[PDB]
Amino acid sequence: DFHIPLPGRQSPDHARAEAEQLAWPRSLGLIRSDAAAERHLRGGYADLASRFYPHATGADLDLGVDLMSWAFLFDDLFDGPRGENPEDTKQLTDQVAAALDGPLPDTAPPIAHGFADIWRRTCEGMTPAWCARSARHWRNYFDGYVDEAESRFWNAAAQYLAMRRHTIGVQPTVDLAERAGRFEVPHRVFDSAVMSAMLQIAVDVNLLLNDIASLEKEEARNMVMGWSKSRSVSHMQNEVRARLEQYLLLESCLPKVGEIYQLDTAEREALERYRTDAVRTVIRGSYDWHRS
């Protein structure tokens, strides 16, 4: 267990989103066999999206489901030898990241057309500055896959954190909470040191909690890997507790941060929505999902 003093939330429309989660990836050629469909349903991806985005229903939640569906289907393409060679990794990531620059050629792989369909829907209704910033977050995500594929090639602690803080994919998840909620945090508050520290805690806690739930599967094939075990789990368990206590400290600074950046009434409300529906949800959502 871990100390996560945030309320658990789930979209009330989760049942419909979970029942219809297969229609989109099968229409994009991402899932082509009935066994692949059942393997997809066993992931609980729509359930995870409904916890990341409890404030979304209908098509807004469907976009959240598709992002989780695509993110896990995309990550599977690197479990084999491709994830060992940084050249073969970058060859695939470049074809997907090209969707951020414009239309894709029809010869693009199906996983690339699926991302393009998600990015198209993500940008609708958002400011140009929001789309540009979110496009930069996707490139850091794709660049992280190439960086980790290089680390696996050489067969080779803050060294582990600096690499996982991009491949975990937390920031593109948080970005969609804005699109799913049809709001935008003030851009100057997003870049603030306080919000930057809050977002880093969300990434650190996510990769720590993910290594705990992935210790057994990786042991057959991680931050826990130095002296002894269990105590190492207890050390990481205290690290998420210290970071969560620091996160609460940073949350209390937001009222004064809003005055420093002279937010108006609408901007203060958007910052509050970003705190509860985007940052808190990405922290608590993955914890409640690992305990389904």
Q: Would residue 3 be called left, alpha or beta, if left means φ above 0 and alpha means ψ between -120 and 50 degrees?
A: beta
Measured in degrees and rounded to the nearest 5, phi and psi for residue 52 equal: -65, -35
Number of residues in the chain: 292
Return the closest-CA partner of residue 163 out of 111, 128, 203, 130: 203
CA–CA separation, 96 and 88 (whole Å): 13
- Residue pair 198/189 in contact (Cβ under 8 Å)? The answer is no
Measure the CA–CA gap between 281 and 4, rounded to whole angstroms. 11
Distance CA 65, CA 53 (A): 9
List, comma-separated, the residues after which the chain is broken, a break being a C to N distance over 2.5 A; otherwise answer none: 156, 221, 225
Backbone angles phi, psi at 136, to 5 degrees: -70, -35
What is the DSSP annotation of the chain? -----S-----TTHHHHHHTTTHHHHHTTS--SHHHHHHHHTT-HHHHHHHH-TT--HHHHHHHHHHHHHHHHHHHTTSSGGGG-HHHHHHHHHHHHGGGTSPPPTTS-HHHHHHHHHHHHHHTTS-HHHHHHHHHHHHHHHHHHHHHHHHHHTT--HHHHHHHHHHT-HHHHHHHHHHHHT----HHHHTSHHHHHHHHHHHHHHHHHHHHHTHHHHHH--TT----SSHHHHHHHHHHHHHHHHHHHHHHHHHHHHHHTT--HHHHHHHHHHIIIIIHHHHHHHHHHTT-
Measured CA to CA, the distance from residue 133 to residue 135 in angstroms comes to 5
CA atoms of 8 and 263, how far apart (whole Å):
29
79 is in an annotated binding site: yes
The three-point CA angle 224-213-227 to 5° equals: 15
Q: Where are the domains of the chain?
A: 14-289
Orientation of helix 193-213 relative to helix 280-289, angle to 10°: 10
Taking Cα atoms as reference points, which of 213, 204, 141 lies closest to residue 176? 141
Does 210 carry a binding-site annotation?
yes
What distance in Å separates the CA atoms of residue 244 and residue 19, rounded to the nearest whole number?
A: 34
CA angle 10, 11, 16 (to 5 degrees): 125
CA-based diameter of the chain, in Å? 55
C-alpha span between 287 and 283 (Å, rounded): 7
Rounded CA gap, 46 and 268, in Å?
30
CB 244 within 8 A of CB 3: yes
Residue 70, C-beta contacts closer than 8 angstroms, at least 6 positions apart: 25, 30, 111, 114, 115, 118
- Residue 214, marked binder: yes
CA–CA gap between residue 286 and residue 71 (Å, rounded): 14
Assigned CATH for 14-289: 1.10.600.10
Ligand-binding annotation for 143, yes or no, is no
In whole angstroms, give the CA distance from residue 142 to residue 153: 17
Sign of CA dihedral 150, 145, 22, 28: negative
| Euclidean distance between CA atoms 247 and 196, whole angstroms | 11
